[PDB]
Design a protein around this ligand. Structure first.
Ligand SMILES: O[C@@H]1[C@H](O)[C@H](O)CO[C@H]1O
Ligand SMILES: O[C@@H]1[C@H](O)[C@H](O)CO[C@H]1O
Lengths: 129, 130
């Protein structure tokens, strides 16, 4: 099995209430030890493919999305909905809040993808591991 | 233009004779400052896509490939030949030496991809950059 080293590491540091984010190419991710840059070029890797992969390696209770996704990227939102269990809660917050959450005290990592479609950003809150 | 921060930073330090490698998922890359892990899952990203991207950002004079790629992965060899110029030398060395070169003194970065097809590894040698 092939997995990202930095992602597997971060997932192992993750417990109840901890956050892990997946982001598009333009999300202003703070430059620190949480930042995990997987971007290769435009749309590689895709946000959706990285999300599908991470979800196989995690127990999630809540996800956070930009309110703006509903209007500006309904295809992404639909792709996300189709991927997650129908029991996990989806909370919509302002995109400006999604940016603050990049620096959340419980944020255990910020994954950067090559995705270029707007508001392809998510935050994943762990259940009890 | 979307770009990897690590790859971009490594290339900024690359001069004549310096090496940069792109590798498949199972290649034993030493866990140091040179390790740039882009692997997501099986065959994502593909070796050939990462190679294509990097060659746009770099001027190369030679490449190193495993002798083993001729028999064991001829389609990858053909894909590499299609990507590189005719005025760049291809040198075949044993895979064991490809592994050694991950620690070469002039190695400026080891990129790991999600590639699963065997011997999908390369080392790129820089020309004069200024
Ligand atoms: O790329 C991100 C968002 O996804 C949105 O596209 C606006 O710019 C950046 O904050
Ligand atoms: O993945 C690499 C090589 O490409 C080969 O497939 C053997 O295993 C690893 O050393």
């Amino acid at each position: 099995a092939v997995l990202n080293e930095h992602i597997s590491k971060a997932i192992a540091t993750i417990g109840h209430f901890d956050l892990l984010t997946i982001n598009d190419a333009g999300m202003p991710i703070p430059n620190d030890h949480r930042r995990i840059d997987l971007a290769v070029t435009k749309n590689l890797p895709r946000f959706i493919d990285v999300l599908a992969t991470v979800l196989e390696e995690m127990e999630i209770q809540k996800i956070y999305l930009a309110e703006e996704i509903k209007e500006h990227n309904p295809t992404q939102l639909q792709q996300i909905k189709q991927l997650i269990s129908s029991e996990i809660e989806i909370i919509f917050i302002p995109h400006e809040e999604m940016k603050s959450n990049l620096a959340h005290p419980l944020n255990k990592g910020n994954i950067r993808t090559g995705e270029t479609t707007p508001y392809s950003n998510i935050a994943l809150e762990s259940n009890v591991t």
